[PDB]
Design a protein around this ligand. Structure first.
Ligand SMILES: Cc1cc(C)cc(-c2nc3cc(NC(=O)c4c(Cl)cnn4C)ccc3[nH]2)c1
Ligand SMILES: [Mg+2]
Ligand SMILES: [Zn+2]
Length: 314
């Protein structure tokens, strides 16, 4: 057989939750196959169809500052780390489906939120009245699966194929941050009343949803230099959207106004308290080995505070 292998440094550090996939685009497909071969197994997919699928997916991500091909592999890598450190808890089909859901979760993103598509009256907002982009991302994933030589799930039974597609659909829809608040609340009560049951399929759904939020925000869990540099790319998109809101004659919300550039450290602080810390806290309670995500989230919170008090620049 042919085993994908990585250089020594990458081979060690890819197992850490805070691994950065680096600036060489041409290595990301190789990194993703390696992660699939070690988390799923070398017999999960025909190598030739996986490669055709990977490259069709890459080709349907856009040249946008943040919601691009590098984000896709980064989110997939965070899922790899979660799966490797909790390997006794997941089914054969869940391993297969979740790295693929992560790779495809932002297909054909143009760098605009669901809210801008509604104010613009984009045709996708007529087709899909909630989770607008996320429903488009899934639809794009099915298109790609149905290309000739691209059905990476060709060996599955008709009913298994339907299950794995249902795992993928739910995990992608869960990346709509508007649904995260509800999902985490439900999971916090279920944890703290002892009702949470991983053999309950609609509970599994909610846990995987939270794993997708954790993976989609994982830039807040990297070393500080990655975290800070990645925040430029995020605001680059947010501010282009806010410009577009202004063109419609609408005042954008604050995070999307490039005039409020100096309030970023405080906005970050707000985001960590209201969203990130709660997310990684609830995930640590449910999956104790994910601890290092929350630890690094706290370190970076502490760094945003240094920036507010002028002991650090950005
Ligand atoms: C200039 C300014 C002013 C005010 C009043 C607020 C903000 C402000 N900045 C915000 C960023 C996020 N989210 C993220 O940074 C994010 C996502 Cl989403 C994924 N990963 N990350 C890291 C959410 C809410 C935010 N409010 C900004
Ligand atoms: Mg998205
Ligand atoms: Zn994303």
């Amino acid at each position: 057989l042919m085993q994908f292998t990585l250089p020594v440094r990458l081979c060690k550090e890819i197992e850490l939750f805070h691994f950065d996939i680096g600036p060489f685009e041409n290595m990301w497909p190789g990194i993703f196959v390696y992660m699939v071969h070690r988390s799923c197994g070398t017999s999960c997919f025909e190598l030739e169809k996986l490669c055709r699928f990977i490259m069709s997916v890459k080709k349907n991500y856009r040249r946008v500052p943040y919601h691009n091909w590098k984000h896709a592999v980064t989110v997939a890598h965070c899922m790899y780390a979660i799966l490797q450190n909790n390997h006794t808890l997941f089914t054969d089909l869940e391993r297969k489906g979740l790295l693929i859901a992560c790779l495809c979760h932002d297909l054909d993103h143009r760098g605009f939120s669901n809210s801008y598509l509604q104010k613009f009256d984009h045709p996708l907002a007529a087709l899909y009245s909630t989770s607008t982009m996320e429903q488009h991302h899934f639809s794009q994933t099915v298109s790609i699966l149905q290309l000739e030589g691209h059905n990476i799930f060709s060996t599955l039974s008709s009913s298994e194929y339907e299950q794995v597609l249902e795992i993928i659909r739910k995990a992608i829809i869960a990346t709509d941050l508007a649904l995260y608040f509800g999902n985490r609340k439900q999971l916090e009560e279920m944890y703290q009343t002892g009702s949470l049951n991983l053999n309950n399929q609609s509970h599994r759904d909610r846990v995987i949803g939270l794993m997708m939020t954790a993976c989609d925000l994982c830039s807040v869990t990297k070393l500080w230099p990655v975290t800070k540099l990645t925040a430029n790319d995020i605001y680059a998109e947010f501010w282009a959207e806010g410009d577009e809101m202004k063109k419609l004659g609408i005042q954008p919300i604050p995070m999307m106004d490039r005039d409020k550039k100096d309030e970023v450290p405080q906005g970050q602080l707000g985001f960590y308290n209201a969203v990130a810390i709660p997310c990684y806290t609830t995930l640590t309670q449910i999956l104790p080995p994910t601890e290092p995500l929350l630890k690094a989230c706290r370190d970076n919170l502490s760094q945003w505070e240094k920036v507010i008090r002028g002991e650090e620049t950005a």
